Design a binder for these strands. Structure first.
Ligand SMILES: [Mg+2]
Ligand code: NA
Ligand code: NA
Length: 324
DNA sequence: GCCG
DNA sequence: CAGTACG
DNA sequence: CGGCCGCTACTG
């Protein structure tokens, strides 16, 4: 499509991201996205600007890659970037921890492993470094959801379990497995993480826990690591959320994504005096001059994903159509 | 970074 | 709270 | 000028 140019930009977008320049990186993330989805290749400056998500600043650079064949901005990128990227790829460590480790003189995982102070999460992230960077065939994602569902329906056959994220969007491979668990009656889902997690631990399915507030009966999510039985099995990331039935649709929509899809949909809802989150879609929300939800509006009835789209004056989209 |  | 994370 | 998703959910 425009790979000759986007591949160069992605490098730049990733550099800003790891350095903590969140908004600039988002800028490139949207320009790079627009290009990759533009039918024909770009050839003119005006041809660029005309595109949404691309402005003068960007259009100018898109020129280079074509005429100049290469972007000269990529030649002055700090030598620190590759190391920052290496560091931030450790689950539990972000741009702030990466830059701190770098300022401290660390340059490799060997340095991190032997000299860095690690949080419980980062220690787990490091021990599964390569695994956390791989994707799994969707078939395996199925085996995992099935494993979780079986264990859950074991103590309550009424429990509804669904694999979301990239899986539900129908991608061939998945980074992790997102399992949404809820119950049709609307109450039989409270305080089950304890039973579910312990059940999964019994059979040795779960290998490590990253995020799991179990001392609290109000736990909403579980982020961990699991591994299927047998030879040739890798450790996989597992994310589970348990939600009340009334919030099923918003939860399903959220967990299905994509992330960028979710953000775009939420941005639209805000322009219409509404608010969308994984818990609910509300209308008549009260916002300050900075657009922050100060006053609550009214929660709208949203029994199905269809309803959320409808209420936002949007054509429904199949999961595969939300793969932004 | 782009957009209103 | 700041950091990092989920889609 | 200033928002860019969520009054998102944990961790320490
Ligand atoms: Mg996923
Ligand atoms: Na990380
Ligand atoms: Na815990």
């Amino acid at each position: 499509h425009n790979l000759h140019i986007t591949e160069k930009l992605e490098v730049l977008a990733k550099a800003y991201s790891v350095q903590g320049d969140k908004w600039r990186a988002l800028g490139y993330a949207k320009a790079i996205n627009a290009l990759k989805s533009f039918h024909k290749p770009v050839t003119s400056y005006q041809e660029a600007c005309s595109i949404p998500g691309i402005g003068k600043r960007m259009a100018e650079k898109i020129i280079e890659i074509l005429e100049s064949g290469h972007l000269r901005k990529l030649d002055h990128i700090s030598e620190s970037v590759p190391v920052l990227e290496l560091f931030s790829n450790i689950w539990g460590a972000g741009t702030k921890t990466a830059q701190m480790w770098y300022q401290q003189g660390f340059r490799s995982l060997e340095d991190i492993r032997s000299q860095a102070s690690l949080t419980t999460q980062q220690a787990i992230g490091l021990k599964h470094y390569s695994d956390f960077l791989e994707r799994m065939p969707r078939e395996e994602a199925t085996e995992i959801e099935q494993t979780v569902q079986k264990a859950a329906q074991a103590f309550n056959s009424g429990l509804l379990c669904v694999a979301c994220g990239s899986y539900r969007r129908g991608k061939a491979t998945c980074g992790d497995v997102d399992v949404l668990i809820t119950h049709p009656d609307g109450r039989s889902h409270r305080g089950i993480f304890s039973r579910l997690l312990d059940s999964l631990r019994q059979e040795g399915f779960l290998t490590d826990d990253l995020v799991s507030q179990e001392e609290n009966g109000q736990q909403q999510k579980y982020l961990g690591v699991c591994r299927l039985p047998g030879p040739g099995r890798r450790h996989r990331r597992l994310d589970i959320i348990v939600v009340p039935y009334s919030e099923f649709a918003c939860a399903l929509l959220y967990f299905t994504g994509s992330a960028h899809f979710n953000r775009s949909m939420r941005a639209l809802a805000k322009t219409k005096g509404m608010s969308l989150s994984e818990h609910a879609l509300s209308t008549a929300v009260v916002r300050n001059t900075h657009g922050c939800k100060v006053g609550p509006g009214r929660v709208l009835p949203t029994p199905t994903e269809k309803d959320v789209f409808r209420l936002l004056g949007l054509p429904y989209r199949e999961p595969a159509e939300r793969d932004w």
